[PDB]
């Protein structure tokens, strides 16, 4: 084939694997938790409605994402 | 002995750097000819 | 925690360590280290951010 | 000159004089006025022969008769001038000097030959430090170095009976003064007394070295040059360039330096300068010679008048420009050419077009011969003037030389052995090599300006090979799998897919035809469309009889299109092949069935007929593309509004503090990809069934003729993804970091793309470019690395005569059967005979080439596993027998004798490797049977609980799915003690759950049903105060080591099982009483006071990515142990614990009675997936994680590791959807696990802990145990390819691809009489390759030798 078509297939692979990585991160399935899995605080049922199966609060979730920003 | 720690890190990590080797090296020589010899030896 | 690692205490010890790190085996000296650290980054001669 | 093996060894000085033709003495080269050579410098006349052929230097003797006489005036032996190219002169180095290779090779040759560290050698050489040389017996060790003042004193110490030098004189004195038999006796002594395995290890190693260096013909002092040869004059010329400027090589410069320094040292010696002067001079000469040889290892090269370091003798051999890789493999080639390739559909597939002018330039010698034959030019010069006039008759004579003369046509990178195919020629106007169309898929060559090169085969053997082996119509089966590689590609399949389709109401609806012939007579005259559904009377010839062809007329119910396609289908095929839509997959399995039924000739002529009719009706379709062809969904604006409102939802909810930034970003990207898939589906359903037309009635819908849809349906080009981007929106551009941008492209290509959206597209577009720029420049690294290891391998026996193959079954990964058995036992030859499930029979003899007839039988009788012979267990010595490689090839018959399978194997594994993502790439609690079929349990250890359900007490019980056929239809891996429902070998119903268990937590369920108590459970010591304390659950759970006391570490956490009184019943079968002990974190719930039921959760114990790139394959063959090695059993017996937590806790396993004591140290940061009271089988999963292939090879055996590697790399391919047959991977493995190790030499003569390769030791013990004696135990190894290629019987081979210097020097000291009989070896030394046609020739020389 051509030097463009190979690049098309590689770009499709790259965007596919990215999109699947970020669909895998979202939960949308699990059992209701009723309270944080880190601090014990309650998860308000609105946030649980937005994501079925939120193992964390918003506070602990933000904290964990924020430590993970430095990738450790 | 620490240069031997450079050796074991080069074994594990799978590479090194000018900063790494220049870190571990034995002080007080720094002629840059002994350095080029020792870098060729680590290669 | 870097202070934890920091062996040297005052200006003299730090200047001595920098002086020996710049040039190996050169014996440490008061004006020696002082001029070395004054000419590493702080004199018109050897350092000029354009 | 059919000489022999080549031989290498040290360069003895008097030998270097026998090579000489007179000492070079002076640094002059030429004479600056008359450009004759000054005598005598690097150049000369009397030393290295005459300048002009048969002419003296001064010019006294200038006739052929005077050859041989040396002129009395300037002593120049009047002879040919090519003798200027073979004479070596020498230098008489005044002081000696150390050869840099035998000094700085890495492991110093002199270091571990004198038993001396390198720094002291550099001392004695560069005059750092004195050194003793046979200091007698007063005080000083022989090697005992000194320094200045110490030698000064010692001269006063022992001025007499003393001997201390320094310089090359010292090393030479040591080496000469050494006596090797003495050191052999001394080393055998200390091998006797000094009983220290490290100590006598290195002792026996050095004695190995010295005995090797003795059994060569060498002497230890030849490593220190006294006489140094000069390369001749014409390998380092001094060419006269135009203008007086000369363009010399660099060796002239280096030798000039060395001759200067030698003369200067001699001059210093005559004066007897003070010792600083002579010392600095000898150092200068040492550096000069060391720069002559290698110009490296010395620390800093001596660059010439450029700033570029000047190349040297160890550098004209090395590198990708040294003579090995750059002029002994890649050499220019007369009789070649090239051009822009082009299309040329008017050709049968066995003839490439070709220009008149390239032809008349390639075949000048042939033309000249023919023209002096037909008397059109009496002399050859006349024939040249003729064919240089391009007269009338030389075109006729060229057509008479180009009748049957196959030109080889090559493309730029020749990956796989179809890359170089021959063709006949067909003389052509123009200058484009009009290639065939079908073959372009094989070359991998579109026509965007790609340039193929034509060679020409000169001889007659080469013409018969360019016809009977490399012709175009003998390589249509791809070497890496039986499927034809003549798949019709893009205009041809669109032609057929337009031809054989059916629109609902075209002209000539329903009218019957008398056959195909008047189907064409209807279509061409126009009375009926090309496609409109129509009864015909086809007549298909099925050939079920033995070779017969039984005609059978009928009235198939077809179109006109299929029928007019039918006039081209040959006899044996059945009409149900061309009655369908004929896409690309179907149009290729058309050719596949043709080749599987009718052989090769009708498949070739049929592929040509297909291309002809395909192009014709593809042109008749007018299959054009226009801007009304890409239909947007009218339900697109709604979907984009809806998703762009859902993002409004997540924005509002983010600024209410309900979700972090990461969560809203993920949710946004999730709703955009969802909108994307919905819009793409909406367009594709507005696109596929869109056409709605009407047969004599209301309306009806059918697959559409939207030109872009046929181009996306046939398989011609594109797919639903590109049709997405042309009509629906186009996704989410992924920025090159890897992170996907969140601002999707709500527009498409039929609409515009405003500035932001196009620009965001730029990221991913340029990442695709910047990767397919690195891929085209590093495309053949894997094939290179494989043919380095798997090259000298040639099918050199008709039948190895064994009965030991590997068991083939259809892979099933917990679901629908991935790879059936007819794709794996298709070609390989059976190992032991096959019995129909009643045994009933002898279904197939053990040596039956399983062609498709036998797969027919095996699939008619439902055979499940066929123990088939395999390349990795062939019993041949330096080769692979005929059968065991099987049959696969571009042909379809058994592999011939000699056909070099190592190379075509490495290329079968390496050419699809172009078709794989170069970056690595990661894809990411109940059992549910699919359908009807009985249950099948292997290694099942179940207990008939008093509860009723079934539970497995074996760690490794596989849950299969068998039918009443007996086949294995499904298999599942039950965890430990899963709650099981149905029977063991019994029947179940389809789609019904049969097994449930605990997802994350491990049951410890009892063995039999008996009373319970506790032992050694003291809280604070062994147990803790656990409880679901809202429920009363007293849980005194086993304490870990960090919570158990230092005597608590000596305690045994336990669960005792009491009988009805207080005793402990024996475990059934064994005599360990009834109880279970438990480790830390063996979480207890109940306590003493209950009788257990089988299936009691006495405890609760808590707790895949498939890389798919090419680098996964590179690391599979490299065999690198992974990060988390799957800890694995070592001795088939009972399990236990060891010395508790010395950082790494120690396992202990024990057999029934034998060598029990094996304990293993494990990082206790990782789970141990073994019980504390079980009998772990050898090769059993103590832990999890990827298990190292070395451990497979050492624990289980060969066939286990080979099935491992083949299934792993087959996963890496059939993930991507690439077919490659497993012969090739098995042969690369047989080259992997070639070396071996020894356990007890015994009745052989190999060192015990020595590593030797399998073929040698196996022939040794085979012939010994063939005698009355006893064999030798060997533990097989397994090397990565990059290391398994690193050992080679030849050194000429290993001087190519390994680093040359280490190879040359190791062989040199070892005196390794390298034979020929490789392929790198003979391709280097330019005789017949012993692989293909050359094999009979080498058998000829084998007969010559040894008689
Ligand atoms: C781009 C590449 C073709 C290039 C030739 C094709 C061939 C195999 C494809 C992946 C696999 O199917 C596994 C997985 C399937 C999921 O459904 C979607 C994601 C995955 C990761 C796919 C991404 C991509 O689409 C791949 C790499
Ligand atoms: C440096 C340059 C590399 C490409 C940049 C190389 C490539 C061609 C070389 C010249 C040619 O030989 C012609 C000419 C021959 C005379 O007799 C000697 C001088 C000339 C000018 C050469 C000097 C130099 O070597 C050139 C420029
Ligand atoms: Mg191209
Ligand atoms: Zn919380
Ligand atoms: Zn003469
Ligand atoms: Zn075999």
Q: Near ion ligand 5, which residues have CB within 5 Å?
A: D 56, 58, 60, 71, 73-74
Contact between D236 and D229 under an 8 Å Cβ cutoff? The reply is no
Q: Which residue of D has its CA nearest to B34?
A: D299
Beta partners for D455? D408
Whole-angstrom CA distances from D260 to D48, D264, D302 are 20, 6, 15
The pair of structure tokens assigned to D575 is 């009409």
Chains with 3 or more CB pairs closer than 8 angstroms to B?
C, D
D1143/D621 Cα distance (integer angstroms): 77
Contact between D341 and D452 under an 8 Å Cβ cutoff? The reply is yes
B vs D, Cβ pairs < 8 A, gives 7
CB contact under 8 Å between D300 and B40, yes or no, is no
Contact between D1112 and D1210 under an 8 Å Cβ cutoff? The reply is no
Q: Which residue of B has its CA nearest to C24?
A: B28
Q: Judge residue D652's burial from the number of C-beta atoms within 10 Å of its C-beta, 0-12 exposed, 13-18 middle, 19 or more buried.
A: exposed
Task: Resolution in Å, one decimal, please.
Answer: 3.7
Q: Is B33 on the interface with C (CB under 8 A)?
A: no
**At residue D854, what are phi and psi to the nearest 5 degrees?**
-70, -30
Could you give the angle at which helices D392-401 and D380-389 cross, rounded to 10 degrees?
100
Q: Where are the beta strands (DSSP E) in D939-981?
A: 942-944, 950-952, 958-962, 968-973, 979-980
Contact between D450 and D341 under an 8 Å Cβ cutoff? The reply is yes
D109/D982 Cα distance (integer angstroms): 72
What is the DSSP-derived secondary structure letter of residue D1215? Answer: H
D331/D334 Cα distance (integer angstroms): 10
Do chain D and B touch: 3 or more Cβ pairs under 8 angstroms? yes
**At residue D369, what are phi and psi to the nearest 5 degrees?**
-60, -50
Q: Which residue of D has its CA nearest to B37?
A: D299
D1169/D1103 Cα distance (integer angstroms): 9
Contact between D680 and D720 under an 8 Å Cβ cutoff? The reply is yes
Cα-only R_g, chain D: 40
Task: Using the atom order of ligand 1, give the atom closest to the CA of residue D915.
Answer: 5
Could you give the angle at which helices D901-910 and D1222-1232 cross, rounded to 10 degrees?
120
User: Is there an atom of ligand 2 within 6 Å of D244 CB?
Assistant: no
**For D635-777, which CATH superfamily applies?**
RNA polymerase Rpb1 funnel domain (1.10.132.30)
Spatial CA neighbour of D175 closest among D1318, D1314, D1309, D1321:
D1309
The pair of structure tokens assigned to D921 is 């790439």
Whole-angstrom CA distances from D185 to D190, D205, D207, D1023 are 9, 14, 9, 65
Task: Catalogue the long-range contacts made by D650-659 (C-beta closer than 8 Å, 24 or more residues apart).
Answer: D653/A50, D657/A58, D658/A44, D658/A46, D658/A47, D658/A50, D658/A58, D659/A47, D659/A50, D659/A51, D659/A58, D659/A61
D335/D466 Cα distance (integer angstroms): 15
Q: Judge residue D462's burial from the number of C-beta atoms within 10 Å of its C-beta, 0-12 exposed, 13-18 middle, 19 or more buried.
A: middle
User: Is there an atom of ligand 2 within 6 Å of D245 CB?
Assistant: yes
Residues of C in CB contact (< 8 Å) with B are 20, 23-25
- Contacts B37 to D, Cβ<8 Å: 299
Contact between D78 and D69 under an 8 Å Cβ cutoff? The reply is yes
The pair of structure tokens assigned to D455 is 């060679």
D222/D8 Cα distance (integer angstroms): 14
Within 10 Å of residue D1256's Cβ, how many Cβ atoms? Answer: 14
Q: Which residue of D has its CA nearest to A6?
A: D772
Question: How far does residue D989's CA lie from ligand 5's centre (Å)?
Answer: 106
Contact between B21 and B40 under an 8 Å Cβ cutoff? The reply is no
Is the torsion defined by CA of A65, A66, A71, A72 positive or negative?
A: negative
Do chain C and A touch: 3 or more Cβ pairs under 8 angstroms? no
CB contact under 8 Å between D772 and A14, yes or no, is no
Spatial CA neighbour of D104 closest among D257, D287, D340:
D287
Contact between D504 and D700 under an 8 Å Cβ cutoff? The reply is yes
Contact between D363 and D401 under an 8 Å Cβ cutoff? The reply is yes
CB contact under 8 Å between B33 and D300, yes or no, is yes
Beta-carbon contacts of A47 under 8 Å, excluding residues fewer than 6 positions away, are A54, A57, A58, D658, D659
Measured at the CA of D529, the angle between CA D523 and CA D535, to 5 degrees, comes to: 80
What is the DSSP-derived secondary structure letter of residue A4? Answer: T
Chain-centroid distance, C-alpha D625: 43
Q: Which helix (H) or strand (E) holds D677?
A: helix D661-687
Question: How far does residue A20's CA lie from ligand 4's centre (Å)?
Answer: 27
Q: Which ligand is nearest to the CA of D883?
A: 6
Q: Which ligand is nearest to the CA of D1107?
A: 1
Spatial CA neighbour of D706 closest among D726, D733, D676:
D726
Whole-angstrom CA distances from D499 to D536, D710, D1176 are 16, 11, 65
Q: Domain D1012-1100 carries which CATH code?
A: 2.40.50.100
Beta-carbon contacts of A39 under 8 Å, excluding residues fewer than 6 positions away, are A57, A59, A60
- Contacts B40 to D, Cβ<8 Å: 297, 299
Do chain C and B touch: 3 or more Cβ pairs under 8 angstroms? yes
D1193/D709 Cα distance (integer angstroms): 52
Question: How far does residue D28's CA lie from ligand 2's centre (Å)?
Answer: 24
D1105/D316 Cα distance (integer angstroms): 47
Whole-angstrom CA distances from D305 to A40, D32, D302, D1117 are 77, 20, 10, 47
D618/D346 Cα distance (integer angstroms): 15
Q: Where are the beta strands (DSSP E) in D123-275?
A: 131-132, 164-165, 224-230
How would you write D222-266 as a 3-class SS string? HHEEEEEEECCCCCCCCCECCCCCECCCCHHHHHHHHHHHHHHHH
Question: How far does residue D417's CA lie from ligand 3's centre (Å)?
Answer: 19
Best of D444, D652, D662 to substitute, by most chain A Cβ atoms within 10 angstroms, is D662
D285/D340 Cα distance (integer angstroms): 56
For chain A, what is the domain count?
Answer: 1
Known binding-site residue numbers of D for Mg(2+): 446, 448, 450
What is the DSSP-derived secondary structure letter of residue D299? Answer: S
Cβ density class D442-457: b for 16+ within 10 Å, e for less: bbbbeeeebebbbbbb
Could you give the angle at which helices D661-687 and A5-25 cross, rounded to 10 degrees?
130
- Contacts D299 to B, Cβ<8 Å: 33, 36-37, 40
Tell me the shortest Cα–Cα distance from B30 to chain C, in angstroms: 7
Helix ranges (H only) for D1233-1299 are 1254-1266, 1281-1284
Q: Is B28 on the interface with C (CB under 8 A)?
A: yes
Q: Is B27 on the interface with C (CB under 8 A)?
A: yes
CB contact under 8 Å between A10 and D917, yes or no, is yes
Beta-carbon contacts of D925 under 8 Å, excluding residues fewer than 6 positions away, are D996, D997, D998, D999
Beta partners for D145? D131
Give the β-pairing of D1144-1150 and D1159-1163. Answer: antiparallel
Do chain C and D touch: 3 or more Cβ pairs under 8 angstroms? no
Beta partners for D1076? D1055
The DSSP line for D1255-1272 is HHHHHHHHHHHHTTS---
The pair of structure tokens assigned to D1003 is 């049951």
Please report where in the chains the tokens 């004059």 appear, as a residue. Answer: D233
CB contact under 8 Å between B28 and C23, yes or no, is no
Question: How far does residue D70's CA lie from ligand 5's centre (Å)?
Answer: 7
Q: Is B3 on the interface with C (CB under 8 A)?
A: no
Beta partners for D937? D959
D750/D723 Cα distance (integer angstroms): 11
Beta-carbon contacts of D492 under 8 Å, excluding residues fewer than 6 positions away, are D437, D610, D611, D614, D615, D618
Contact between D953 and D989 under an 8 Å Cβ cutoff? The reply is no
DSSP-based three-state secondary structure for B1:
coil
How would you write D612-629 as a 3-class SS string? HHHHHHHHHHCCCCCCCC
Nearest to D660 among A13, A21, A62 (CB): A62
Q: Which residue of C has its CA nearest to B31?
A: C24
The pair of structure tokens assigned to D273 is 């300068």
D861/D821 Cα distance (integer angstroms): 13
Range of the domain at A55: 1-72
D1290/D1309 Cα distance (integer angstroms): 15
Beta-carbon contacts of D1067 under 8 Å, excluding residues fewer than 6 positions away, are D1007, D1073, D1074
Closest residue by CA, ligand 1 atom 13: D923
What is the DSSP-derived secondary structure letter of residue D1019? Answer: B
D524/D522 Cα distance (integer angstroms): 6
Beta-carbon contacts of D75 under 8 Å, excluding residues fewer than 6 positions away, are D46
D672/D680 Cα distance (integer angstroms): 12
The pair of structure tokens assigned to B18 is 């000018």
**At residue D453, what are phi and psi to the nearest 5 degrees?**
-110, 140
- State yes or no: cis peptide before D40, omega within 30 of 0: yes
Is the torsion defined by CA of D1180, D1182, D1184, D1188 positive or negative?
A: negative
* Category of D827 on φ-ψ map: left (φ > 0), alpha (ψ -120 to 50) or beta: left
Scanning D763-782 for CB atoms below 8 A from A yields 764-765, 767-769, 771-772, 775-776
Best of D299, D1123, D1302 to substitute, by most chain B Cβ atoms within 10 angstroms, is D299
Spatial CA neighbour of D1338 closest among D1346, D1330, D461:
D1330
Identify the residues whose C-beta falls under 6 Å from ligand 1. Answer: A 9, 12-13, 16-17, 20; D 923, 1216
Largest pairwise CA distance in chain A = 58
Q: Which CATH number is D926-996's, of 2.40.50.100, 3.40.50.12280, 3.90.1150.10, 3.20.20.150?
A: 2.40.50.100
Cα-only R_g, chain B: 10
Tell me the shortest Cα–Cα distance from B13 to chain D, in angstroms: 12
Contact between D902 and D783 under an 8 Å Cβ cutoff? The reply is no
User: Is there an atom of ligand 2 within 6 Å of D241 CB?
Assistant: yes
Q: Is B40 on the interface with D (CB under 8 A)?
A: yes
- Contacts D297 to B, Cβ<8 Å: 40
The pair of structure tokens assigned to D201 is 């290890």
Give the β-pairing of D341-342 and D433-434. Answer: parallel
- Contacts B29 to C, Cβ<8 Å: 24
Beta-carbon contacts of D434 under 8 Å, excluding residues fewer than 6 positions away, are D341, D342, D343, D344, D347, D352, D353, D354, D426, D428
Is the torsion defined by CA of D708, D712, D717, D722 positive or negative?
A: positive
Ligand 2 binding pocket mutation candidate from D238, D239, D240, D241 (most atoms within 8 A of CB):
D241
What is the DSSP-derived secondary structure letter of residue D584? Answer: H
Best of B28, B29, B32 to substitute, by most chain C Cβ atoms within 10 angstroms, is B28
Whole-angstrom CA distances from D1063 to D1010, D1052, D1069 are 11, 19, 18
């Amino acid at each position: 084939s051509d030097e463009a078509d190979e690049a098309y297939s590689v770009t499709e692979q790259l965007t596919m694997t990215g999109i699947n990585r970020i669909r895998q991160k979202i939960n949308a399935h699990g059992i209701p938790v009723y309270l944080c899995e880190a601090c014990g605080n309650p998860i308000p049922e609105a946030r649980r409605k937005i994501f079925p199966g939120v193992t964390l609060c918003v506070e602990c979730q933000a904290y964990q994402e924020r430590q993970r920003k430095h990738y450790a | 002995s620490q240069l031997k720690l450079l050796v074991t890190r080069g074994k594990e990590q799978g590479y090194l750097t000018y900063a790494e080797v220049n870190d571990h090296l034995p002080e007080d020589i720094v002629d840059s000819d002994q350095i080029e010899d020792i870098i060729q030896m680590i290669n | 925690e870097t202070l934890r690692v920091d062996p040297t205490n005052d200006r003299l010890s730090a200047l001595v360590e920098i002086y020996r790190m710049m040039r190996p085996g050169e014996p440490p000296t008061r004006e020696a280290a002082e001029s070395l650290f004054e000419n590493l980054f702080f004199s018109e001669d050897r350092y000029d951010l354009s | 000159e059919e000489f022999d093996a080549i031989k290498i060894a040290l360069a003895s000085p008097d030998m270097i004089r026998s090579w000489s033709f007179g000492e070079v003495k002076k640094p002059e080269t030429i004479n600056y006025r008359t450009f004759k050579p000054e005598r005598d410098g690097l150049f000369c006349a009397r030393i290295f022969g005459p300048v002009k052929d048969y002419e003296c230097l001064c010019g006294k003797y200038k006739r052929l008769k005077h050859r041989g006489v040396i002129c009395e005036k300037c002593g120049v032996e009047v002879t040919q001038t090519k003798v200027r190219r073979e004479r070596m002169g020498h230098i008489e180095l005044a002081s000696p000097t150390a050869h840099i290779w035998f000094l700085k090779s890495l492991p110093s040759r002199i270091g571990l030959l004198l038993d001396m560290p390198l720094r002291d050698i550099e001392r004695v050489l560069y005059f750092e430090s004195y050194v003793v040389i046979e200091g007698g017996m007063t005080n000083l060790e022989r090697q005992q170095i000194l320094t200045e003042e110490q030698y000064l004193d010692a001269l006063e110490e022992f001025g007499d009976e003393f001997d201390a030098k320094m310089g090359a004189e010292a090393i030479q004195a040591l080496l000469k003064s050494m006596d090797l038999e003495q050191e052999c006796e001394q080393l055998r002594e200390e091998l006797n007394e000094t009983n220290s395995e490290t100590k006598r290890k290195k002792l026996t190693k050095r004695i190995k070295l010295l005995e090797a260096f003795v059994q060569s013909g060498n002497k230890p002092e030849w490593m220190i040059l006294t006489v140094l040869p000069v390369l001749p004059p014409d390998l380092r010329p001094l060419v006269p360039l135009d203008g007086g400027r000369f363009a010399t090589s660099d060796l002239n410069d280096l030798y000039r330096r060395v001759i200067n320094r030698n003369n200067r040292l001699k001059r210093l010696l005559d004066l007897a300068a003070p010792d600083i002067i002579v010392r600095n001079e000898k150092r200068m000469l040492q550096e000069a010679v060391d720069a002559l040889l290698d110009n490296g290892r010395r620390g800093r090269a001596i660059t010439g008048s450029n700033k570029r370091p000047l190349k040297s003798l160890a550098d004209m051999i090395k590198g990708k420009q040294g003579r090995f890789r750059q002029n002994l493999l890649g050499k220019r080639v007369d009789y070649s050419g090239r051009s822009v390739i082009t299309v040329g559909p008017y050709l049968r597939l066995h003839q490439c077009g070709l220009p008149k002018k390239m032809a008349l330039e390639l075949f000048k010698p042939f033309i000249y011969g023919k023209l002096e034959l037909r008397g059109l030019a009496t002399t050859i010069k006349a024939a040249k003037k003729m064919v240089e006039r391009e007269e009338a008759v030389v075109w006729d004579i060229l057509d008479e030389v180009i009748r049957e003369h196959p030109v080889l046509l090559n493309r730029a990178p020749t990956l796989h052995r179809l890359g170089i195919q021959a063709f006949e020629p067909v003389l052509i106007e123009g200058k484009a090599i009009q290639l065939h169309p079908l073959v372009c898929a094989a070359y991998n060559a579109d026509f965007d300006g790609d340039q193929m090169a034509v060679h020409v085969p000169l001889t007659l053997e080469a013409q018969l090979e360019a016809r009977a082996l490399m012709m175009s119509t003998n390589n249509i089966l791809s070497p890496a799998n039986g499927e034809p590689i003549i798949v019709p590609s893009q205009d041809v399949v669109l032609g057929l897919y337009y031809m054989t389709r059916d629109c609902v109401n075209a002209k000539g609806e329903g009218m019957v035809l008398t056959g195909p012939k008047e189907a064409e007579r209807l279509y061409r005259s126009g009375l009926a469309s090309l496609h409109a559904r129509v009864k015909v009377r086809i007549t298909e010839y099925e050939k079920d009889a033995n070779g017969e062809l039984v005609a059978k007329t009928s009235l198939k119910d077809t179109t006109v299109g299929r029928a007019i396609l039918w006039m081209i289908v040959p006899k044996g095929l059945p009409y149900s092949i061309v009655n369908q839509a004929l896409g690309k997959k179907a149009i290729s399995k058309m050719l596949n069935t043709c080749y599987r039924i009718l052989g090769l000739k009708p498949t070739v002529i049929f592929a040509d007929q297909i291309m002809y009719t395909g192009f014709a009706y593809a042109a008749r379709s007018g299959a054009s593309v226009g801007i009304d062809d890409m239909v947007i969904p009218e339900k697109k604006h709604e979907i984009i509004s809806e998703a762009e409102a859902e993002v409004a939802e997540i924005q509002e909810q983010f600024q209410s503090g309900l979700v972090t930034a990461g969560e809203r970003y993920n949710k946004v990207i999730d709703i955009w990809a969802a909108a994307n898939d919905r819009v793409s589906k909406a367009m594709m359903d507005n696109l596929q069934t869109e056409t709605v037309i009407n047969r004599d009635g209301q309306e009806e819908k059918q697959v559409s003729f939207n030109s872009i849809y046929m181009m996306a349906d046939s398989g011609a080009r594109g797919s639903a993804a590109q049709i997405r981007q042309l009509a629906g929106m186009r996704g989410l551009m992924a920025k090159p970091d890897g992170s996907i941008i969140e601002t999707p492209i709500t527009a498409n290509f039929r609409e515009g793309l405003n500035v932001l959206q196009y620009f965001i597209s730029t990221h991913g577009a340029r990442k695709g470019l910047a990767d397919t720029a690195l891929k085209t420049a590093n495309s053949g690294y894997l094939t290179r690395r494989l043919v380095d290891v798997a090259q000298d391998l040639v099918v050199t026996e008709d039948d190895c005569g064994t009965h030991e193959g590997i068991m083939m079954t259809p892979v099933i990964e917990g679901g629908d059967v991935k790879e059936p058995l007819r794709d794996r036992v298709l070609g390989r030859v059976t190992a032991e005979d096959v019995l129909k499930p009643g045994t009933a029979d002898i279904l197939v003899p053990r040596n039956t080439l399983l062609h498709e007839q036998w797969c027919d039988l095996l699939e008619e009788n439902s055979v499940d596993a066929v123990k088939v012979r395999s390349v990795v267990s062939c019993d041949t010595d330096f080769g692979v027998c005929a059968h065991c490689y099987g049959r696969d090839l571009a042909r379809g018959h058994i592999i011939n004798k000699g056909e070099a399978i190592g190379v075509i194997a490495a290329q079968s594994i390496g050419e699809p490797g172009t078709q794989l993502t170069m970056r690595t790439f990661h894809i990411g609690s109940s059992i549910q049977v699919k359908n009807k079929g009985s249950i099948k349990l292997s290694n099942v250890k179940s207990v008939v609980n008093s509860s009723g359900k079934l539970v497995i007490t074996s760690r490794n019980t596989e849950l299969k799915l068998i039918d009443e056929f007996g086949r294995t239809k499904e298999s599942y891996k039950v965890p430990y003690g899963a709650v099981l429902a149905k029977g063991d070998g019994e029947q179940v119903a389809g789609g019904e759950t049969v097994a449930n268990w605990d997802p994350h937590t491990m049951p410890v369920i009892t063995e039999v049903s008996g009373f319970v108590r506790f032992t050694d459970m003291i809280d604070g010591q062994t147990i803790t105060r656990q409880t679901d304390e809202l429920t009363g659950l007293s849980s005194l759970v086993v304490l870990d080591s960090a919570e158990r006391t230092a005597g608590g570490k000596d305690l045994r956490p336990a669960l005792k099982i009491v009988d009805a009184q207080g005793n402990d019943v024996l475990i059934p079968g064994t005599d360990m009483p009834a109880q279970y002990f438990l480790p830390g974190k063996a979480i207890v719930q109940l306590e003493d006071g209950v009788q257990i039921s089988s299936g009691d959760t006495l405890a609760r114990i808590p707790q895949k990515d498939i890389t798919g790139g090419l680098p996964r394959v590179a690391d599979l063959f490299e065999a690198r142990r992974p990060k988390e090695p799957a800890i694995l059993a070592e001795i088939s017996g009972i399990v236990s614990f060891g010395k508790e937590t010395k950082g790494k806790r120690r396992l202990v396993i024990t057999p029934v009675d034998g060598s029990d004591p094996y304990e293993e140290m494990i990082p206790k940061w990782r789970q141990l997936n073994v019980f504390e009271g079980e009998r772990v089988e050898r090769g059993d999963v103590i832990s999890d994680g990827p298990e190292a292939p070395h451990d497979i090879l050492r624990l289980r055996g060969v066939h286990a590791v080979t099935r491992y590697i083949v299934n792993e790399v087959q996963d890496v391919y059939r993930l991507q959807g690439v077919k490659i047959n497993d012969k090739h991977i098995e042969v690369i493995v047989r080259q992997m696990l070639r070396k071996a190790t020894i356990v007890n030499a015994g009745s052989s003569d190999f060192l015990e802990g020595e590593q030797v390769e399998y073929s040698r030791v196996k022939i040794a013990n085979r012939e010994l145990e063939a005698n009355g004696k006893v064999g030798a135990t060997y533990s097989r190894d397994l090397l990565g390819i990059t290391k398994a290629s690193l050992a080679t019987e030849s050194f000429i081979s290993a001087a190519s691809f390994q680093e040359t210097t280490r190879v040359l020097t190791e062989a040199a000291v070892a005196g390794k009489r390298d034979e020929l009989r490789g392929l790198k070896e003979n391709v280097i030394v330019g005789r017949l390759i012993p692989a293909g046609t050359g094999y009979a020739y080498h058998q000829d020389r084998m007969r010559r030798r040894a008689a």
